[PDB]
């Protein structure tokens, strides 16, 4: 059975107006800005941008890659597919 999300979990994450995007739940580094309540810091592969999302926008990677894990025209998307499949826990800073 599922647990709550924790840092390191891999997902496709959904923002209004973008397709479901390869992403991970980030840690919050010592001293770094914290998210709001009930939200997680989402690092988006490819773009390397962060946003704060709640679980309704987070689709676990193993379950959803058959559907969402396909090439896309948007900037950073296909780079993001490589990262999530090949080195999802690297430093991309």
mmCIF file of C-alpha atoms in Angstrom:
data_model
loop_
_atom_site.group_PDB
_atom_site.id
_atom_site.type_symbol
_atom_site.label_atom_id
_atom_site.label_comp_id
_atom_site.label_asym_id
_atom_site.label_seq_id
_atom_site.Cartn_x
_atom_site.Cartn_y
_atom_site.Cartn_z
ATOM 1 C CA UNK A 1 0.000 0.000 0.000
ATOM 2 C CA UNK A 2 1.042 3.664 -0.614
ATOM 3 C CA UNK A 3 2.729 5.840 1.975
ATOM 4 C CA UNK A 4 2.702 9.625 1.875
ATOM 5 C CA UNK A 5 5.127 11.281 -0.559
ATOM 6 C CA UNK A 6 8.714 11.652 0.692
ATOM 7 C CA UNK A 7 11.845 13.416 -0.754
ATOM 8 C CA UNK A 8 13.386 11.362 -3.594
ATOM 9 C CA UNK A 9 10.049 10.054 -4.920
ATOM 10 C CA UNK A 10 9.808 10.266 -8.727
ATOM 11 C CA UNK A 11 6.597 11.518 -10.354
ATOM 12 C CA UNK A 12 5.015 13.168 -13.346
ATOM 13 C CA UNK A 13 3.758 16.483 -12.056
ATOM 14 C CA UNK A 14 0.859 18.440 -13.525
ATOM 15 C CA UNK A 15 0.703 22.225 -13.857
ATOM 16 C CA UNK A 16 -2.182 24.074 -15.602
ATOM 17 C CA UNK A 17 -1.276 24.536 -19.254
ATOM 18 C CA UNK A 18 1.701 22.135 -19.335
ATOM 19 C CA UNK A 19 1.636 18.343 -20.025
ATOM 20 C CA UNK A 20 2.454 15.940 -17.203
ATOM 21 C CA UNK A 21 6.180 16.589 -16.632
ATOM 22 C CA UNK A 22 8.973 14.266 -15.256
ATOM 23 C CA UNK A 23 9.815 15.470 -11.721
ATOM 24 C CA UNK A 24 10.944 14.519 -8.202
ATOM 25 C CA UNK A 25 9.991 15.531 -4.642
ATOM 26 C CA UNK A 26 13.013 17.596 -3.439
ATOM 27 C CA UNK A 27 14.414 17.856 0.037
ATOM 28 C CA UNK A 28 14.440 21.274 1.594
ATOM 29 C CA UNK A 29 18.128 22.167 2.138
ATOM 30 C CA UNK A 30 19.188 23.623 5.473
ATOM 31 C CA UNK A 31 18.398 27.327 5.388
ATOM 32 C CA UNK A 32 16.269 27.177 2.207
ATOM 33 C CA UNK A 33 12.794 28.582 1.699
ATOM 34 C CA UNK A 34 10.149 26.099 2.879
ATOM 35 C CA UNK A 35 6.920 25.348 0.938
ATOM 36 C CA UNK A 36 3.431 26.220 2.240
ATOM 37 C CA UNK A 37 1.413 23.714 4.314
ATOM 38 C CA UNK A 38 0.331 20.502 2.549
ATOM 39 C CA UNK A 39 2.641 21.360 -0.421
ATOM 40 C CA UNK A 40 5.904 19.740 -1.646
ATOM 41 C CA UNK A 41 8.923 21.287 -3.425
ATOM 42 C CA UNK A 42 8.791 19.793 -6.954
ATOM 43 C CA UNK A 43 11.977 19.807 -9.036
ATOM 44 C CA UNK A 44 11.108 19.514 -12.788
ATOM 45 C CA UNK A 45 13.642 17.569 -14.891
ATOM 46 C CA UNK A 46 14.837 19.232 -18.068
ATOM 47 C CA UNK A 47 13.837 22.788 -17.029
ATOM 48 C CA UNK A 48 15.409 22.387 -13.599
ATOM 49 C CA UNK A 49 12.673 24.793 -12.310
ATOM 50 C CA UNK A 50 11.000 24.302 -8.862
ATOM 51 C CA UNK A 51 7.314 24.767 -7.946
ATOM 52 C CA UNK A 52 5.206 23.905 -4.906
ATOM 53 C CA UNK A 53 2.428 21.428 -5.631
ATOM 54 C CA UNK A 54 0.068 19.272 -3.610
ATOM 55 C CA UNK A 55 -0.618 15.524 -4.165
ATOM 56 C CA UNK A 56 -3.533 15.966 -6.510
ATOM 57 C CA UNK A 57 -0.915 17.155 -9.099
ATOM 58 C CA UNK A 58 1.634 14.342 -8.474
ATOM 59 C CA UNK A 59 1.493 11.050 -10.387
ATOM 60 C CA UNK A 60 3.996 8.377 -9.188
ATOM 61 C CA UNK A 61 6.492 7.559 -11.944
ATOM 62 C CA UNK A 62 6.359 3.741 -12.104
ATOM 63 C CA UNK A 63 2.543 3.704 -12.468
ATOM 64 C CA UNK A 64 2.315 6.544 -15.044
ATOM 65 C CA UNK A 65 5.397 6.324 -17.297
ATOM 66 C CA UNK A 66 3.590 4.058 -19.803
ATOM 67 C CA UNK A 67 1.139 6.927 -20.371
ATOM 68 C CA UNK A 68 3.173 10.107 -19.842
ATOM 69 C CA UNK A 69 6.721 8.927 -20.589
ATOM 70 C CA UNK A 70 6.726 9.954 -24.269
ATOM 71 C CA UNK A 71 8.585 12.660 -26.290
ATOM 72 C CA UNK A 72 7.157 16.191 -26.299
ATOM 73 C CA UNK A 73 7.778 19.343 -28.340
ATOM 74 C CA UNK A 74 8.162 21.618 -25.261
ATOM 75 C CA UNK A 75 11.506 23.044 -24.070
ATOM 76 C CA UNK A 76 13.370 20.770 -21.663
ATOM 77 C CA UNK A 77 10.857 17.917 -21.831
ATOM 78 C CA UNK A 78 13.016 15.311 -23.613
ATOM 79 C CA UNK A 79 16.043 16.303 -21.570
ATOM 80 C CA UNK A 80 13.783 15.699 -18.582
ATOM 81 C CA UNK A 81 12.830 12.177 -19.726
ATOM 82 C CA UNK A 82 16.528 11.255 -19.889
ATOM 83 C CA UNK A 83 17.248 12.591 -16.393
ATOM 84 C CA UNK A 84 14.346 10.843 -14.718
ATOM 85 C CA UNK A 85 15.223 7.501 -16.370
ATOM 86 C CA UNK A 86 19.069 7.706 -16.142
ATOM 87 C CA UNK A 87 20.110 9.890 -13.138
ATOM 88 C CA UNK A 88 16.978 11.030 -11.172
ATOM 89 C CA UNK A 89 18.783 11.687 -7.866
ATOM 90 C CA UNK A 90 21.771 13.707 -9.225
ATOM 91 C CA UNK A 91 22.606 17.295 -8.312
ATOM 92 C CA UNK A 92 21.310 19.483 -11.147
ATOM 93 C CA UNK A 93 22.302 22.772 -9.444
#
